[PDB]
Ligand SMILES: O=C(O)c1ccc[n+]([C@@H]2O[C@H](COP(=O)([O-])O)[C@@H](O)[C@H]2O)c1
Ligand SMILES: O=C(O)c1ccc[n+]([C@@H]2O[C@H](COP(=O)([O-])O)[C@@H](O)[C@H]2O)c1
């Protein structure tokens with residue numbers, strides 16, 4: 001894993017300069033396509049894209065796992081929903097499936113720790129049947145977190161060898177906004193009350209308990225904010241570790257990764273703590289309706305493109321933003337140039 | 347035109363209720379797809395869509411015209427750019443062309459008043475070679491504004507008979523953020539300084555003059571805020587009137603219209619003043635980087651989906667949002683249902 005982190009490439013400033021000059025000469029007032037222009041330049045700097053903003057095959061990786069903290073009464077969805085929904089993912093009837101189909105992306109469903117019998121058709125990388133209840137101890141051992149990061153990182157960059165140039169990250173796991181909140185609190189130094197949300201429709205009256213659980217998790221585990229792996233293993237979950245793995249893998253591969261919602265923000269904070277070099281490869285999608293989204297995004301210095309009040313998870317927001325990445329590429333390659341129309345601007 | 351306004355249909359509450367019930371039963375926590383859900387219900391209520399959120403053919407109508415106020419030094423782009431860019435529209439090299447192609451939409455370029463010889467391939471509805479300079483008098487006569495509204499409204503609903511179910515509105519015209527600002531000031535009661543922006547890269551040092559011009563336009567013409575046609579004819583432009591026409595026409599046709607940027611907001615304010623019944627058919631796209639966007643959107647009670655710092659115009663933002671409308675339809679029709687998976691939630 002040390003080799004992985006060490007070999008993440010820096011962005012190509014040469015390709016970015018060439019891209020910027022090309023964009024400035026297109027048929028429009030300079031800077032007028034705003035963040036679409038910035039996104040094109042960002043893509044051009046990613047080594048896996050071969051010096052130009054382009055999109056080949058697209059994949060959304062959905063990390064599925066159960067959480068022991070579900071027993072603390074922090075979620076209203078039956079625990080079995082993780083297993084049921086994971087199977088639905090193989091049938092194409094879920095939210096991320098429908099949105100990925102619209103974007104022409106393939107969904108890869110990965111079981112990194114569902115508490116049920118193995119599901120045929122789902123990629124099997126299960127660490128255990130659900131992680132430990134973070135309210136009374138760690139979610140997993142450091143060894144388990146490291147092993148899963150390496151496994152997922154390898155799977156991710158291996159897809160790159162099959163033509164994938166754009167990744168979207170997602171998750172599925174009942175009770176997972178609890179460890180996500182714990183992680184966000186630890187990494188940002190914000191009090192649990194400011195980052196704990198209603199997750200999947202938790203009744204307002206049960207929020208107090210959820211906040212109490214997050215605080216106990218942190219007090220009991222004492223995760224070190226300066227060690228991303230320590231935080232993930234202590235107050236995270238297998239799904240969260242898996243998402244961090246996709247980000248490290250895509251970065252190693254020099255390719256872009258679209259974030260999703262709140263859960264993905266928590267994983268991104270961990271990934272950036274572990275390897276700051278991962279940051280230039282992350283692209284935000286939407287602004288999650290979860291209470292702690294604003295704080296998490298502020299610490300990542302990210303401004304999402306889409307304001308849809310979405311809070312489904314599954315990688316649904318990442319899939320919805322794929323057309324925006326393709327639009328930036330289309331602008332770059334297909335627009336005419338000012339000079340060719342003899343248009344001169346101040 | 348009185349008949350047109352009188353016959354705009356009210357939204358179908360029955361279809362909307364059926365849509366809401368269907369969305370609540372899909373495979374996800376209730377309300378979790380947020381504004382995508384609200385958008386689907388909004389679409390279901392539009393009579394031209396036949397009781398369900400669906401998208402058939404898509405068209406972006408780009409209204410092109412020149413403005414006499416260009417002579418007041420309020421724009422840095424050469425006046426001939428309107429004519430040049432309008433021809434580029436027929437070649438598919440412009441920003442809206444490239445983005446519409448990505449969304450599978452056709453672009454219709456309409457000349458409603460370019461100050462140049464007619465351009466082959468562009469739809470000809472020219473009122474005159476540029477409108478009057480609003481700094482010294484009206485842009486056009488009330489008769490001219492009314493005639494153009496009716497003509498464009500008919501053209502728009504006629505496309506509906508050819509399979510178009512989703513419209514996007516756009517414009518092209520040097521100096522047009524000046525009349526747009528004047529209109530926004532009149533309709534919202536905001537001072538010109540709060541709504542006048544840099545348009546297509548106007549140097550910060552020339553802003554003062556642009557603000558002075560807007561104030562003179564309003565003082566000299568005395569447009570009546572309660573009469574949308576009066577405002578359009580006095581301090582508007584042919585392109586702005588044309589955009590208002592697309593909105594009235596789509597509403598009469600019971601079909602959705604996606605707004606674009608600042609210019610489109612000014613036209614929407616006029617359209618809603620003329621006929622409040624038009625409002626349920628308007629769908630925002632992006633949040634224009636123009637200074638007066640926030641005020642204009644607040645008065646329309648609209649929150650755009652996309653935050654791209656875009657300020658190109660041409661209907662580029664409307665085209666970029668078309669995939670979002672298709673996503674809401676895909677969610678509605680393609681997602682599985684909770685009951686079918688035996689999932690019961692509180
Ligand atoms: O992605 C988000 O921003 C998001 C926000 C709130 C809830 N969720 C989803 O709902 C689940 C977590 O909610 P909960 O209440 O069980 O902690 C999990 O399967 C997520 O995919 C997802
Ligand atoms: O759509 C917007 O929000 C927008 C904001 C600023 C400038 N524009 C475009 O630039 C032109 C107007 O800018 P200007 O400086 O000549 O008033 C016109 O052709 C518009 O399409 C468009």
Ligand SMILES: Cc1ccc(O)cc1C
Pocket residue numbers: 027028029343345423427431518546658659660
């Ligand atoms: C200069 C300029 C202004 C507005 C446009 O839509 C396009 C161009 C090229």
Ligand SMILES: Cc1ccc(O)cc1C
Pocket residue numbers: 077081085172200312313314373374375689691
């Ligand atoms: C209940 C529930 C929770 C999260 C999902 O992604 C989907 C469903 C159906």
